[PDB]
Amino acid sequence: AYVPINENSTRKAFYVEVSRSDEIQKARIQLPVFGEEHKIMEAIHHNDVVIICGETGSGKTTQVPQFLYEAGFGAEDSPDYPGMVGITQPRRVAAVSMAERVANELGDHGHKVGYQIRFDSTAKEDTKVKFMTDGVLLREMMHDFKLTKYSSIIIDEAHERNINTDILIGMLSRCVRLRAKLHKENPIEHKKLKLIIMSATLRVSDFSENKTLFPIAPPVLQVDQFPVSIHFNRRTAFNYTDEAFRKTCKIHQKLPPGAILVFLTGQQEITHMVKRLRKEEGQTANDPLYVLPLYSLLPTKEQMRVFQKPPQGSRLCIVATNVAETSLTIPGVRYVVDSGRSKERKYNESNGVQSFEVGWVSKASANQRSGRAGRTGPGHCYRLYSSAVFEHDFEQEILRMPVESIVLQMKSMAIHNIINFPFPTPPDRVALSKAIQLLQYLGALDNKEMITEDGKKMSLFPLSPRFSKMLLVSDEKACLPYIVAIVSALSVKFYKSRSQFSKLDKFSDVFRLLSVVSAMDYVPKEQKEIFMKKNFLRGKLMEEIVKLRKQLMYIIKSNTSKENIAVVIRNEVIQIKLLKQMICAGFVDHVAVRADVLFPDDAKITNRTSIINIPYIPVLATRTPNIEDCFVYIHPTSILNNLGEMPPKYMLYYSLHLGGNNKTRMNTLCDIASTPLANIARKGLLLTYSKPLGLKTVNLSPTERYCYVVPRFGKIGWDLNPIAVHQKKQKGQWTVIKFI
Amino acid sequence: AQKKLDAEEQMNKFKVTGRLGFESHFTKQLREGSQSKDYSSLLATLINFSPAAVDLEIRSLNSFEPFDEIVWFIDALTQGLKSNKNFELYETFMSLLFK
C-alpha cells in the first residue's frame, strides 16, 4: 500500500465534497440506498458477505460502490489504496451506462470509475470502482483464481440467475475460504475478501435463507415509488405492431409530459417500431418525437443522450428490450408499454439444440416493468395482453435439463470443478456425471476431466456439444449448408415420391432431409404449392429449416471454423459414404448391429403386398452402458422398418424409446460402416483398444511402434477388424495417433 | 522419412482378412488365474511355451498406473517357488521382467 497517495486522496475528497460539489450529493441522498449507508459500512465490517435486496430504482448499483469507496477515502484504515471495488453486471449496456452515470456523480476529480467489457475496456489502478460483465471476471479467474487483485466483489442482479452469476457464487464457496482467513479448514480470523450480493425482490431467500445459501450471504438488507396504474388490453385498443405505434401516438396527445418506455421482444421488432416512428397521422408526430432504440448490441445504452430528458417541445419515446427492466434505468419514464413478450434461450437436453424462442413475460417481470414509470411522477402501465393471459400464460429448469452444454461452457470461465458449483436449487450429481460421460465420449473432455482442443471449439460454439461437433465435421467433409440447416432446426404414389427423394443407394435419413430441401429450393413459383402437396411436406417448417441453416453458418464462421467470402457467411453425385461418417460423428456412442439369420433377407417370407422382414438386433454402446446388448427394433415411422438386403450391418440413432408391446424401438437411424465408426469411437474412454498381435510390427523407439491393433467398443463392447495403426507410446501408453 | 516407408510397405503387403481372437490365450489364462487366485494351471502353460514365445509374451504385459497384470504375474512366480518345482525357470521368468 502507498501512504502519500492515501492522505492526498483523503484531503482531496473532503475538500471537494465539503466545498466544491454539494449539489449532486443532494441527489444521492434522495436515493433510498443513502438512508442505510452507515449501516452498509458497518455490515461489511462485521460480515464478509452481505446481501442487498432492492427494487427497481432503489439506487443499489450506483450508490453502494461509491459509499464503500468514499468510506475508505475518509479513513486511515481501510485506506484508499487497498480499496479496489469490482462490480458484476449481466449485460454490456448496463456496465457502460452505470459507469458513465457514476462518473458524472463524481465529477472531473480524476479516474475513479470505469468499465471493462469484452473489447471495450480500460484497466484500473488502486482506489477504483469498476463495472464489468460477469464473463470478464470469470476469464480473469484464470490468472487470479482466488481473487487477489480486488478487495470487494459486488455481484449485482443475481435474481436473473444467469449461468455466470450462479457459477461465480458456487466458485465463491471454494474461493472465500483461502483468501478469507480459513487456514487448513479452520476459521482463524476476519475474512479479508469482502463480497456484496445484490438482488431484486425475486426469490430473495434463494440468496438469503435456502438450502444452498451458506456461501451466498448471512445478513440481508431490504432497500425500498409513486403510483403506477395498471391497464390491460381490455382498457387499451392496440392489437399489433402498427397498433403499438398507434399507442405511442395516443399518449402524445393526452397524458401530460413524460417519457414513454416501450418494452419489446428483441432487435427485429425494435427495428420495425423504430421505422414506424421515423418514416411514417404519423408524420404529425415524427418531428415532435425523439425515438431511441435500446438493446445490448446498440450504442445508445452507453450514450448520455438516453438518460438525458428531451429538448423542449419534443416527447421522448424509448423502444427497448428487457434491458430496461433491471439493467438500464432511465428516470424520466411515466408511460410504460409492456408487450408481454420477450426472448429466452431454452436448452433441450434430449435434442442437444439451444433454441432462442419468443416466450411470454413473467408475472414478476410485468410488475418490475410497472415500477419503471413511478420514479419521477405518477404513471401508467399499458400491458398489451388480456387479464386472463396474466393468470395462465405468465410464469410466477436447472433440475430438468441435460447439463452437457453448461459443464463444457463453465470450463471457458475457468470453473473446472462442476460438482463444487452451488445454485439456488442444485442439480443431482448423477446428472452432472452423466453429462461429463457424454462429453468424454465425444472427446470434449479427456478421461481425467480436462478440456480438449475440440472441447474448447465446442464451448465457443452457440449450441449443444453433439451438434456443434456435427457442424465441425461438416467443415472437414465439405457438406456445410446441408448440415448447418439440420443442426439449426434441432437447436430452434406417395411412397415412391419418398423413395425417389431418398436417393438409393443412399439410405441416410439425414441426407434425405437435405435432398427434400434441395428439391424445395428447386420448386420456384406455383410449383412450391403442388410439390408440398405431392410429397406430404410442411412449407413453413421447410422455410424455418432453411432459416436455421444460415444461422449455423453465421455462428461457425464467428467461431473461426469456416472461411468467409467478401465478409459474407454462406451455407453453400454426393459422397454418401462420407456423409454417414459425419452423421456417425454426432450420434456416437449410440450404435446398433443387425444379426443373421433372423434379421436379414432370410425373413423374406411370405406376407404378400406389405412384405415384413423380422429384425433381430441389439444395441452396442459403451457410453450408455444400460442399453448395451439390449434387444431393439426399428420404429414404424423410420424407413428402415421392415427392410432387408442392407449393405453394412451397423447403424446409429439419436433416440431410442420403449412403447406399446414392450418393443424397444429406434426412432431414427442411419446405415454406417465399421471403418467410419472406428475413428468416431477413437475420441477417448468409450472406445476399447487391445495389445498388438502373422504380421511383424516395426518399433522405431520406446514410443513409435506400429502394429495391427484390435479395437473394442464398450455393459457390452463388440470387437472389430484390426487397424494398422501408428501408436506413439506417450506416458507409457500405446495411444493410436492415426489409422494407417 | 525413407526408413518409415519400409514399415508402411510391409503393412500394405499383408492384408489378411482372417480374424484372430482379440484376447490372446496367455492374457486370458493370466486373467482366469488371477480371478481363480490359483495359477497352478497358469504356470503349466509357461513351461510349455517356446523360448521364442516367452520374450514375445512377457514384453506383451499391460502396464499402467494401476499395474494389474504385473502384480498378477509376480504372484504367479511367488506361488511357483512355494511349490519348489522348476526352480531354474521361474527365476528366469523373474529376471526377464527386469529386462
Residue A474, CA distances (Å) to A37, A483, A561, A585 in order: 58, 6, 10, 10
- In what side-by-side order are the strands of the sheet with A669-672? A656-659, A663-666, A631-634, A617-620, A591-593, A650-653, A669-672
Tell me the nearest-neighbour CA distance from A710 into chain B, angstroms.
6
HEC string of A571-638 equals CCCCCHHHHHHHHHHHHCCCEEECCCCCCCHHHCCCCCCCCCCCCCEEEEECCCHHHCCCEEEECCCC
Beta bridge partners of A565: A568
Distance in angstroms (rounded) separating the CA atoms of residues A738 and B6: 18
Distance in angstroms (rounded) separating the CA atoms of residues A581 and A677: 7
Q: What value does the CA radius of gyration of chain A take, rounded to a whole number of Å?
A: 31
Cell triple for A619 = 444395441
Collapsing DSSP to helix, strand or coil, B49 comes out as: coil
Q: Are A664 and A572 in contact (CB under 8 A)?
A: no
CB within 8 A of A226, min separation 6: which ones? A374, A375, A376, A377, A378, A379
Distance in angstroms (rounded) separating the CA atoms of residues B40 and A376: 93
Q: Helix A509-520 crosses helix A480-491 at what angle (to 10 degrees)?
A: 100
> Is the peptide bond between A505 and the residue preceding it cis, with omega within 30 degrees of 0?
yes
Cell triple for A299 = 450504442
Question: Considering only CB atoms, which chain B residues are within 8 Å of A691?
Answer: 24, 27, 60, 62
Cell triple for A605 = 417370407
Question: Considering only CB atoms, which chain B residues are within 8 Å of A695?
Answer: 10-11, 14, 16
Distance in angstroms (rounded) separating the CA atoms of residues A34 and A52: 13
Q: Are A683 and A442 in contact (CB under 8 A)?
A: yes
- Closest by CA to A101, choosing from A244, A375, A306, is A306
Distance in angstroms (rounded) separating the CA atoms of residues A376 and A379: 9
Distance in angstroms (rounded) separating the CA atoms of residues A308 and A318: 12
Distance in angstroms (rounded) separating the CA atoms of residues A332 and A308: 9
Cell triple for A488 = 439449426
Q: Is A696's CB within 8 Å of B10's CB?
A: yes
Distance in angstroms (rounded) separating the CA atoms of residues A11 and A7: 6
Spell out which chain A residues touch chain B, with contact meaning CB-CB distance below 8 angstroms.
690-693, 695-696, 698, 700, 706, 710, 712, 719, 721, 724, 732-733, 740
Determine how many CB atoms are found less than 10 A away from the CB of residue A12.
Answer: 15
Q: Are A103 and A88 in contact (CB under 8 A)?
A: no
Residue A202, CA distances (Å) to A49, A161, A172, A375, A389 in order: 19, 10, 21, 20, 21
Q: Is A712's CB within 8 Å of B20's CB?
A: no
Going by their DSSP bridges, the two strands A289-294 and A315-320 should be labelled as: parallel
CB within 8 A of A172, min separation 6: which ones? A49, A195, A215, A216
Q: Are A684 and A622 in contact (CB under 8 A)?
A: no
Determine how many CB atoms are found less than 10 A away from the CB of residue A382.
Answer: 26
N- to C-terminal Cα distance for chain B? Answer: 30
Eight-class DSSP state of A45: H
- In what side-by-side order are the strands of the sheet with A704-709? A704-709, A723-728, A736-739
* Angle subtended at Cα A626 by Cα A621 and Cα A632, rounded to the nearest 5 degrees: 70
Q: Are A335 and A229 in contact (CB under 8 A)?
A: no
Q: Which helix (H) or strand (E) holds A549?
A: helix A539-558
Determine how many CB atoms are found less than 10 A away from the CB of residue A375.
Answer: 18
Q: Are A674 and A648 in contact (CB under 8 A)?
A: yes
Eight-class DSSP state of A296: T
Collapsing DSSP to helix, strand or coil, A708 comes out as: strand
Tell me the nearest-neighbour CA distance from A442 into chain B, angstroms.
24
DSSP code string of A98-162? HHHHHHHHTTTSSS-EEEEETTEE----SSEEEEEEHHHHHHHTTTSTT--S-SEEEE--GGG--
Phi-psi region of A687 (alpha: psi -120 to 50; beta: other; left: phi over 0): beta
CB within 8 A of A91, min separation 6: which ones? A133, A296, A323, A327
Q: Is A149 exposed, middle or buried (0-12, 13-18, 19+ CB in 10 A)?
A: exposed
CB within 8 A of A720, min separation 6: which ones? A674, A677, A678, A710, A711, A712, A713
Q: Are A294 and A320 in contact (CB under 8 A)?
A: yes
Residue with cell 434379421: A599
Tell me the nearest-neighbour CA distance from B5 into chain A, angstroms.
11
Distance in angstroms (rounded) separating the CA atoms of residues A699 and B6: 12
Q: Are A65 and A85 in contact (CB under 8 A)?
A: yes
Residue A410, CA distances (Å) to A415, A457, A718 in order: 5, 13, 34
- Closest by CA to A690, choosing from B31, B43, B74, is B31
Alpha carbon A578 to its chain's center: 32
- Closest by CA to A121, choosing from A154, A90, A95, A91, is A95
Distance in angstroms (rounded) separating the CA atoms of residues A99 and A97: 5
DSSP code string of A480-538? HHHHHHHHHHHH--HHHHHHHHH-TT---HHHHHHHHHHHHTT--TTHHHHHHHHTT--
Distance in angstroms (rounded) separating the CA atoms of residues A561 and A250: 50
Q: Are A32 and A179 in contact (CB under 8 A)?
A: no
